[PDB]
């Protein structure tokens, strides 16, 4: 059963969580090819593992930038959690290591690019197309939450499309293992649940609110709350007054009203029946949850095959200092 599968999933996770993989490669083992994406601490590059010819995506984090942004514990969470998880729609952490200047996380290379890129270019996804992706996120969150993990940064920028058109979730920078509630103000403005904005303390329900935002954005082509400045976005979120495009199906609107619910005792994913309120919802009536997990469903879109599915970014030399930086802070990495 699902409860049985998850219980076993947890046994596997806890072993790796209690005894994390560390120092499993070195920089010179990889040929660096091209930047695939960037972020506050650094960049992610396509690399080739010299000994095997395998391609990977190497995330490079400048330790000093991490410290300046007060993200040490978050970065330790990111690596400890990612090395411990295992799910079909989660990007794999293949190796990790550090040097005097940087932290490195060598992850699975996902060649189809960011959902963000395709969504912006095409404008919006059909409901069946959006549903296909949404189903994968639902299953992924079911898995993560069962391990007491909150993800906290769902958005199209963080969802990569693989060669078969399935999603791979990336960027565990705000992922956290927590029983009960937590308080950090983190995420992306458009995707924040009201309780985060209002400093109320919050739990895994914030991921379900975020799913509502994602589904809305996939199906509309724009998110339910936007404005040129984050402050104005926050004002719209806390009002929770959502308007739906006229092309939204009745079922879709109903699901979204239950996900984008300000009231925590009414928000789908967070009720007595948990994730099953979502899985059994009418909008997902056509969804075969087992077939999705087994990747037996034909994707509504497979990317054209090479890095042309990613934007070009400015490159910079990866300079390593002759002095160790922030050693104590990142001891466990």
């Amino acid at each position: 059963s699902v409860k049985e599968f998850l219980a076993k999933a947890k046994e596997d996770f806890l072993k790796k969580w209690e005894s994390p993989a560390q120092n499993t490669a070195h920089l010179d083992q990889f040929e660096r090819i091209k930047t695939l994406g960037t972020g506050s601490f650094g960049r992610v590059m396509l690399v080739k593992h010299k000994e095997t010819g395998n391609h990977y995506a190497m995330k490079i984090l400048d330790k000093q930038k991490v410290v300046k942004l007060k993200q040490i514990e978050h970065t330790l969470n990111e690596k400890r959690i990612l090395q411990a998880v295992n799910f079909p729609f989660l990007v794999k952490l293949e190796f990790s290591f550090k040097d005097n200047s940087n932290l490195y996380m060598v992850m699975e290379y996902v060649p189809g690019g960011e959902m963000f890129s395709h969504l912006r270019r095409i404008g919006r996804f059909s409901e069946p197309h959006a549903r296909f992706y949404a189903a994968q996120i639902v299953l992924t969150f079911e898995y993560l939450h069962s391990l007491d993990l909150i993800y906290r940064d769902l958005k199209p920028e963080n969802l990569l499309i693989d060669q078969q058109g399935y999603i791979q979730v990336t960027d565990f920078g705000f992922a956290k293992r927590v029983k009960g509630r937590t308080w950090t103000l983190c995420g992306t403005p458009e995707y924040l649940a009201p309780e985060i904005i209002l400093s109320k303390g919050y739990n895994k329900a914030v991921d379900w609110w975020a799913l509502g935002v994602l589904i809305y954005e996939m199906a509309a082509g724009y998110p339910p709350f936007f404005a040129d400045q984050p402050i104005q976005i926050y004002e719209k979120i806390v009002s929770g007054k959502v308007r739906f495009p006229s092309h939204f199906s009745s079922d879709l609107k109903d699901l979204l009203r239950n996900l984008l619910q300000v009231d925590l005792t009414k928000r789908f994913g967070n009720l007595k029946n948990g994730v099953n309120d979502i899985k059994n919802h009418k909008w997902f009536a056509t969804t075969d949850w087992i077939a999705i997990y087994q990747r037996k469903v034909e994707a509504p879109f497979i990317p054209k095959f090479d890095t042309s599915n990613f934007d070009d970014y400015e490159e910079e030399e990866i300079r390593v200092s002759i002095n160790e930086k922030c050693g104590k802070e990142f001891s466990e990495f």
């Binding site: 940064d153 958005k155 724009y222 404005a227 984050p230 308007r243």
Partner: peptide
């Protein structure tokens, strides 16, 4: 249209996380 308002907005590119 809301779509037009979005496309003319400053929030159509990659969105930074809040740190």
């Amino acid at each position: 249209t809301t779509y037009a308002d979005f496309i003319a907005s400053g929030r159509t590119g990659r969105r930074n996380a809040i740190h």
